[PDB]
Structure 1
Amino acid sequence: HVIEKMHHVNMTPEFKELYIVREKQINGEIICKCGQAWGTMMVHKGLDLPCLKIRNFVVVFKNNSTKKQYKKWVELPITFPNLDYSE
C-alpha cells in the first residue's frame, strides 16, 4: 500500500515476522536472512510500519516467469491501493 502516492509499504503481520530489524535508533533497517537490506522502519499517522525499496527485491510475474529488476518504482506498470487506515 502507498502513502500519499509517495511511499510504498507493507502491513502484513506474517511478513513482519519474516524480516529482521537492526539499529546502529529512531528508524530500523530491515535485514534479510542473507543479510541484505530490504527497507526502513517509518512511523505515519500514529502507526508503526516498515517500508521497502523496489531496488532491494526481484519482481516475478505470473503469466511469464521472467526475473526482472527496476531501480525506481515508476517503471513498474502496477498500481497500488492506498492505505485501508481502519486497521
Structure 2
Amino acid sequence: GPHMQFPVEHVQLLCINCMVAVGHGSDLRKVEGTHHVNVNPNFSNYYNVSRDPVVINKVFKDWKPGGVISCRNCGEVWGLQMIYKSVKLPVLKVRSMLLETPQGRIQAKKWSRVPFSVPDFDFLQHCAENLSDLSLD
C-alpha cells in the first residue's frame, strides 16, 4: 500500500549491478549530511581501491579523500574512500547501490530519495570503540 515504509533492517546494501549484498542499509551512515558512506570492515572485500591516491576536484578539511572505490563483486565504481578521524568510510552512491526490501527493490539516484534511514556517523561511539578509554566491561 501507500506510506512508502522501508526499515534499514529491511533495506540491504547491494550492487544494483551485482546485487549480492555488499553490506546492510542499517550499517551505513551519513557524514555531515554531505555524502553517504557505508561503514563496514568486510566492505574492503566488497570493493577495491584504485591505484592512484587522491582523484577528486578539490580536497576537503572536515575529512580527507582516499581511493576510488569499485564494487569487487562487479566493478561499478562507487566513488572514493573517505577518511575521518582515522575511520575508513567508503563513499558510495545511491544509484550504484540497491535497496532490497520485502516490498520490492528500489534504486534511486539521490540519497534525497533514499527510503531507508541513514543516521550520521556516531563519532562518539566510533571514538568509544576506537579509544575505549571509557571502559571495556
Provide the alpha-carbon RMSD of the alignment: 1.9
Cα displacement (A) at 1:76: 1.9
Unaligned runs of 5+ in 1: none
Partner of 1:41: 81
Partner of 1:13: 41
Contact 2:94 2:114 in 1 (8 A): no
Matched, 1:57 2:97: yes
Matched pairs, number: 85
Larger Rg, first or second structure (1 or 2): 2
Identity of paired residues, percent?
35
Partner of 1:68: 106
Structure 1 runs, 4 residues or longer, greater than 4 Å off: none
Partner of 2:67: 28
TM-score, structure 2 as length reference: 0.53
